[PDB]
RNA sequence: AAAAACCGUAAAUCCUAUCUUUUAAAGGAAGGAGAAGUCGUAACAAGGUUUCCGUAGGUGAACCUGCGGAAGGAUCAU
RNA sequence: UUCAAAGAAUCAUUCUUUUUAAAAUCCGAUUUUGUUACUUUGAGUAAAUUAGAGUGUUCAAAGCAAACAGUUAAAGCAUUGUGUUUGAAUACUAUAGCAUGGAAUAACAAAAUUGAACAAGCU
RNA sequence: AACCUGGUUGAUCUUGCCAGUAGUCAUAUGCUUGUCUCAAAGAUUAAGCCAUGCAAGUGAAAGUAUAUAUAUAUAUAUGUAGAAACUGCGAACGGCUCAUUAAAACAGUUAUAGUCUACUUGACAUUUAUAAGGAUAACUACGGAAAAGCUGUAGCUAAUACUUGCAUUAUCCUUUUGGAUAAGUAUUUGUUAGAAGGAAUUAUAACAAAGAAGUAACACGUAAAGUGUGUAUCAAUCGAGUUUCUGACCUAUCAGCUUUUGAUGUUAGGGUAUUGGCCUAACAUGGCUAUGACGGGUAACGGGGAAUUAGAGUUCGAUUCCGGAGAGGGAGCCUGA
RNA sequence: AAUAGAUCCGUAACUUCGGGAAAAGGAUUGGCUCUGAGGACAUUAAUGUUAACUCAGAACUGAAACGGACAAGGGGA
């Protein structure tokens, strides 16, 4: 048969997973869920190789069995569950909240987040659909189908999502002052306010994004994540603060200690 | 006068009595000609009138065969660089394209063409533009960088 | 079954490898006829049941001028756009020409407007003559092989004129 | 449920034709290599008949002869 | 088939900026004017491998770690305890495709057995 | 490290090849081998044959438990379990090999506005009820043969195996509140209007006809209401099938191929999950080709990749991973997403 | 004895290029219901009078057999 492959080779694992080459030849294939395998990572490596909480699959699973790991305040027991680009995960008894953000190099790193900001999660919508009764339901990048969205919300506008009530709070547009985050582009990891767009005739629309250091970089429209307006990032950024510090002048920063 | 085969053509999706012919502007920075807008012809495979939707690749080509019914042969001359001899190389291949009866096509005419869903086992392209050009010799022969 | 074992457009033959896969399938055809309304079901790929009809007598038929539809029973097939052996062996396709009883549509017309929404359409003398005769000509449009029911529409106008011109310079 | 018929997929076998790949084959006709053999003097000197080309014929062989060419000639020259 | 002139900055030079015809745009000024080849930039550029970062497996073949004070406490922060910093970046992923600046060099077209544009009247 | 040397001669200078030289993650073999780390290993040829043994099974809150065992106040209620079996899922993953394979597969680049999609997530639904019906295993008792992972009758019981079936909501009017109006999800047919995309016959809405499959007659128990299993539609997830464009070794002592037997396209229809000569019937004679078609050969799976590399290049790539193929050779089929 | 008439297709070695050749080798021909297509005479693009035997496809049907008798090459190396 040629059915769905139920294995993932270690060498074929995505680069940001960072799997040792000698630690076997199989990678934990993420189960079907809210996000794609390439742009999401499993709790296994999240808590074994990134959090360093566990050292083995068996101990990862016996941590997982207890309802102490919560994503969006929802307990999860799928061992290879795709967390996604942007989400809120919580560990209860030790009372910590991790928001999955990017890194300037372009990896996945959990970021410490308080309860208040954890209650404030953002989802980029993908498309809106009209159903029976002339009602519009919009699907986010998290595979989340939220019905009854604001009429002012557009296809590329992002919407504030509340975790408990599962409701929309406020929409953010794609304006020249819209602070965005490149999701899967070659310039992944750099935050920017966008400088302009170019509406091309039926091809991948590109946008030129302006950095804090006046660096202009072009990336596709299909892989951006509006994270707030020009006032401030609505999401607590990681230590690197979303500024792609250059490779040549990274070594001078690294060498002083 | 319009239907001669051992069947009938409906031009489905046009309506006949409600109202308030049929055509579709297909977009892509292109408008339907007035002749096709008002035309009495009916074709289920014409991009303007039929169900076929254009998407994929838009090419420009050289008309090779027009005597065939509602279909034309399109060749695309180009140069193929060779790494070993750092020189160019005249190389082509002719692809089939469905031509609506709206466009009056002559031999050797340059035609802009769009990709659609598989229309025949080979024909999967539709004409959108024809620019008149009196050629000399054979359309098998003249070489155009397009 | 499809997509191979066929010479290329140039005329050269593609020698066969990659022996036939299941997803190609290509199920055998069906020849729905007049008789008892019994059909089968065929498990399509991905658990998609298909209503396969091999014998049909009654279905739905729509008056397009009035935008209505009534359930009725077909009497016979009289023409198909495909080969004449099909109409000779009494088969139904999605572009066949069949005879439909005029009684239900006539009763609906008398109930709604009378006489032997958007009403007052003046109908046509030819269809009135066919109604007084009692049988009318209409064309099935639904696909009996897939949906398993023979649904059609009443054909009127210049297309009806063409059909009668090709039926009966004529024998 | 046994069983039968009909299109349909079609295993497998045989007829003819074509293509591809090895091998047998009585025998024939070649080529090449071997340390020296016999007969002849063909070419290298004007090699004792200048050599060579194409063609044709003759001869045991190298070779000979005719026709028309070349010097790579033995003539850069009344 | 569109030339050049004028101005600031390193050493004596080199380098940077503006315009100089016509047609539609804005009440003396607001700005678009072939196609392709070609050429410059980008985004999609799987990993392993490749060159290479950083990293003393006794060096190396390595691998992607580890380092930091700590015969047992100090700092940092939390309103008694809580370890910290980090690395897995970079270029490549055809020649073909997408977008992109383009003055040079190549071609193609419009270029008069006539074809135009402007103004007035007519439909 | 952008490198040369010996060999025609009495001696010389050339052309010219031979030989020498070094590398190979490139094979085999001879001699020799005190240590440690590291580790290719039946591809070449026989995709030949296989003895044997193993390689896919699965029950920890949670489907069915009088085979049976054990514990709490006393034949009473709970339990902890539990062989066999029914049921559910997987077994279509993985592993091996490279025979076939020459615009085919593969690689980069597109579409699917021409489709399907297990588990999972997120939204969510229409035409006897203090809870309905049969139909069967294991088992009991008689056997058959040498046996199969073989098997008959009698009897029975269950289940989340199989099958029936029990409100209410929305809309219009005087205008919180009273009346009246109507009740099909997918899917198909006929007649119209019509947030997005790039273009809809899109979403969706209206009318007239049909119209499946469900909306829990099921199981455990968390806040000092919960969970499992199952179900209609939509979106993503894990993918898959088709598909645009660009790219391949040698060969003309392969120049004309294809077209009744579909070749090239039109119409109509069948079939598929969907487009399509995929196929059928009719119609037209078309389509490719010195820019090498059609043939033939490859001791040719393709790719990133390997060796040698100053740059050009030349050769190799069965084989760590991707994609394709096969399970002695064809062909057919159930089940199952 | 074996087909042998006719139509459709196909036809090698060799050759003096003319042939070999009816090479070899095949299918069909039964029946009736059918259908269609192909000349001369007249009217201000068409409608009326009047004479052929050559093809083709859908049928079913008959005891799956048919140039039905007569009439007629056996081929090949």
Q: In chain B, which among 7-46 make CB contacts under 8 A with chain C? A: 7-8, 16-17
Task: Please give the structure tokens belonging to residue B142.
Answer: 């003249």
d(CA B14, CA B17): 10
Beta-carbon contacts below 8 Å between A and B: 3
How many residues belong to chain C?
171
Q: Which has the closest alpha carbon to C35: C95, C105, C89, C113? A: C89
Q: The domain that contains A163 carries what CATH number? A: 2.40.50.740
- Is residue C68 classed as helix, strand or coil in its secondary structure? strand
Which residues, 6 or more positions from C2, have their beta carbon under 8 angstroms from its beta carbon?
C24, C26
Q: Which residues contact A72 (CB under 8 A, 6 or more apart)?
A: A87, A88, A121, A163
Report, in angstroms and rounded to the nearest whole number, the Rg of chain B calculated over CA atoms: 18
Q: Are C48 and C59 in contact (CB under 8 A)?
A: no
User: CA of B119 to nearest chain A CA: how many angstroms apart?
Assistant: 22
Q: What is the secondary structure of C111-126 as a DSSP string?
A: HHT-----------HH
The subunits that touch chain A, with at least 3 C-beta pairs less than 8 Å apart, are B
CA A99, CA A85: separation in Å to the nearest integer? Answer: 9
User: Residues followed by a break in chain B, C–N over 2.5 Å?
Assistant: 20
Interface contact B8-C162, CB threshold 8 A: yes
Residue A91 structure tokens: 């560990």
Q: How far is the C-alpha of B80 from the C-alpha of C151, rounded, in Å?
A: 56
Q: Answer yes or no: do A104 and A59 share one domain.
A: yes
Protein-strand G interface by C-beta, 7 A: C 84-85, 88, 171
Both tokens assigned to B146: 């397009």
β partners of residue A127: A139
Nearest residue to A33 (alpha-carbon basis) of A137, A139, A142, A110:
A142
Q: Name the helix (H) or strand (E) containing B38.
A: helix B34-38
Q: What range defines the domain where residue A66 resides?
A: 1-116
Q: A64: which 2 tokens?
A: 């997982």
Residue C61 lies in domain: 27-171
Which pairs with CB-CB distance under 8 Å and at least 24 residues apart come from B78-84?
B78/B145, B79/B145
For residue C43, give the DSSP letter. E
Q: Are B58 and B76 in contact (CB under 8 A)?
A: no
Tokens of C41: 């079901």
Q: Residue B92 CA to chain centroid, in angstroms?
A: 19
Angle at the Cα of B10 from the Cα atoms of B4 and B16, rounded to 5 degrees: 125
Of A131, A151, A171, which residue constitutes the final position of a domain? A171
A201 touches chain B (CB under 8 A): yes
Report if residue C17 sits inside a domain: no
Count how many residues are written for chain B: 146
DSSP bridge partners of A193:
none
What structural domains does chain B harbor? 1-146 (2.40.50.1000)
- Residue C137 sits at the vertex; the CA angle it makes with B12 and C140, to the nearest 5 degrees, is 45
- Token readout for A168 is 């929309």
Which one of B13, B17, B68 would you mutate to disrupt binding with C, by most C Cβ within 10 Å of its Cβ?
A: B17
DSSP class of A49: I
Alpha helices in A41-173 (DSSP H): 43-45, 57-64, 115-118
- A158, A225 contact by CB (below 8 A): yes
Q: Which residues of chain A neighbour B29 with C-beta distances below 8 Å?
A: 201
* Domain-located, residue A252: no
Domain boundary pick from A101, A116, A131: A116
Q: Of C94, C97, C99, which Cα lies nearest the Cα of C142?
A: C94
Q: What are phi and psi of B38, to 5 degrees?
A: -95, -5
* Nearest residue in chain C measured CA to CA from B93: C10
- The answer to whether residue A251 is domain-embedded is no
Find the CATH number of the domain harbouring A22.
3.10.290.10
Given a contact cutoff of 8 angstroms between Cβ atoms, the answer to whether C123 and C65 are in contact is yes
CA distances from B146 to B76, B92, B96, C124 (A): 7, 11, 16, 56
Number of structural domains (chain C) is 1
**B6: distance to nearest CA of chain C, Å?**
7
Q: Give residues with Cβ within 8 angstroms of B113, minimum separation 6.
A: B58, B59, B60, B61, B74, B97, B125, B126, B127, B128
**What is the Cα–Cα distance from A149 to A171, expressed in whole angstroms?**
10
**Nucleotide of closest approach to C85 (CA, C1'):** G58
Same domain, A44 and A107: yes
Contact residues for C62 (Cβ-Cβ < 8 A; gap 6+): C68, C69, C70, C151, C152, C153, C154
* Cβ(C158)–Cβ(C168) below 8 Å: no
In order, the DSSP letters of B37-86 are HH-----SS-TTTSS--EEEEEEEEEEEE-SSSSEEEEE--EE--BTTTT
What's this structure's resolution in Å? 2.8
| Residue C26 · residue C14 · CB < 8 Å | no
Statement to judge: residues A108 and A181 lie in one domain: no
How far is A25 from C47, CA to CA, in rounded Å?
A: 36
Is residue B123 within 8 A of residue B71, CB to CB? The reply is yes
CA distance C95 to chain B (A): 9
């Amino acid at each position: 048969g040629k059915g769905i492959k139920k294995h993932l080779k270690r060498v074929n694992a995505p680069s940001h997973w960072m799997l040792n080459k000698m630690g076997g030849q199989y990678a934990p294939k993420t189960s079907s869920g809210p996000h794609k395998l390439l742009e999401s990572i499993p709790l296994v490596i999240l808590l074994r190789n990134r959090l360093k909480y566990a050292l083995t699959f068996d101990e990862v699973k016996m941590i997982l069995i207890q309802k102490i790991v919560k994503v969006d305040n929802k307990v999860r027991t799928d061992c290879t569950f795709p967390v996604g680009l942007m989400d809120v995960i919580h560990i209860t008894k030790s009372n910590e909240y991790f928001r999955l953000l990017y890194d300037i190099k372009g990896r996945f790193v959990p970021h410490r987040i308080t309860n208040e900001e954890s209650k404030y999660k953002l989802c980029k919508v993908k498309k809106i659909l009209l159903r029976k009764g002339r009602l519009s339901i919009a699907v986010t990048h998290d595979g989340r189908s939220i019905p009854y969205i604001h009429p002012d919300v557009k296809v590329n506008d992002t919407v504030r999502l509340d975790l408990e009530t599962g409701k929309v709070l406020e929409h953010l547009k794609f304006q020249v002052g819209s602070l965005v985050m490149v999701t899967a582009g070659h310039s992944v990891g750099r935050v920017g306010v966008i400088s302009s767009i170019d509406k091309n005739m039926g091809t991948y629309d590109i946008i030129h994004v302006k950095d804090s250091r006046n660096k202009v970089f072009a990336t596709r429209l299909s892989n951006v994540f509006v994270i707030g307006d020009n006032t401030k990032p609505y999401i607590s950024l990681p230590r690197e603060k979303g500024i792609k510090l250059d490779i040549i002048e990274e070594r001078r920063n690294r060498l002083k200690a | 006068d319009v239907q001669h085969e051992r069947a009938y053509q409906k031009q489905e999706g046009a309506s006949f009595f409600n109202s308030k012919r049929y055509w579709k502007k297909v977009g892509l920075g292109f408008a339907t000609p007035k002749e096709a807008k008002e035309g009495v012809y009916v074709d289920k495979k014409c991009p303007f009138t039929g169900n076929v939707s254009i998407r994929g690749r838009i090419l420009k080509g050289m008309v090779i065969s027009n005597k065939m019914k509602r279909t034309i042969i399109i060749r695309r001359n180009y140069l193929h660089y060779v790494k070993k001899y750092n020189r160019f190389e005249k190389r082509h291949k002719n692809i089939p394209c469905h031509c609506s009866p709206c466009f009056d096509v002559k031999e050797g005419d340059i035609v802009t063409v769009g990709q659609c869903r598989p229309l025949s086992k080979t024909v999967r392209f539709n004409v959108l533009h024809v620019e008149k050009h009196q050629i000399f010799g054979s359309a098998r022969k003249q070489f155009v960088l397009f | 079954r499809d997509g191979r074992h066929k010479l290329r457009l140039t005329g050269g033959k593609k020698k066969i490898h990659k022996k036939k896969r299941k997803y190609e399938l290509g199920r055998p055809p069906s020849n729905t006829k007049l008789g008892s309304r019994q059909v089968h079901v065929v498990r399509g790929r991905g658990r998609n049941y298909k209503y396969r009809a091999i014998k049909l007598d009654s279905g739905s038929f729509s008056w397009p001028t009035f935008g209505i539809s009534k359930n009725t029973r077909i009497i016979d097939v009289v023409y198909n756009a495909s080969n004449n052996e099909l109409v000779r062996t009494k088969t139904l396709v999605k572009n066949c020409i069949v005879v439909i009883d005029s009684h239900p549509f006539t009763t609906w017309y008398e109930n709604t407007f009378g006489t032997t929404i958007g009403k007052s359409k003046n109908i046509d003398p030819l269809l009135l003559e066919q109604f007084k005769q009692g049988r009318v000509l209409a064309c099935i449009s639904s696909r009996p092989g897939q949906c398993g029911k023979a649904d059609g529409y009443i054909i009127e106008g210049d297309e009806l004129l063409f059909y009668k011109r090709k039926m009966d310079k004529r024998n």
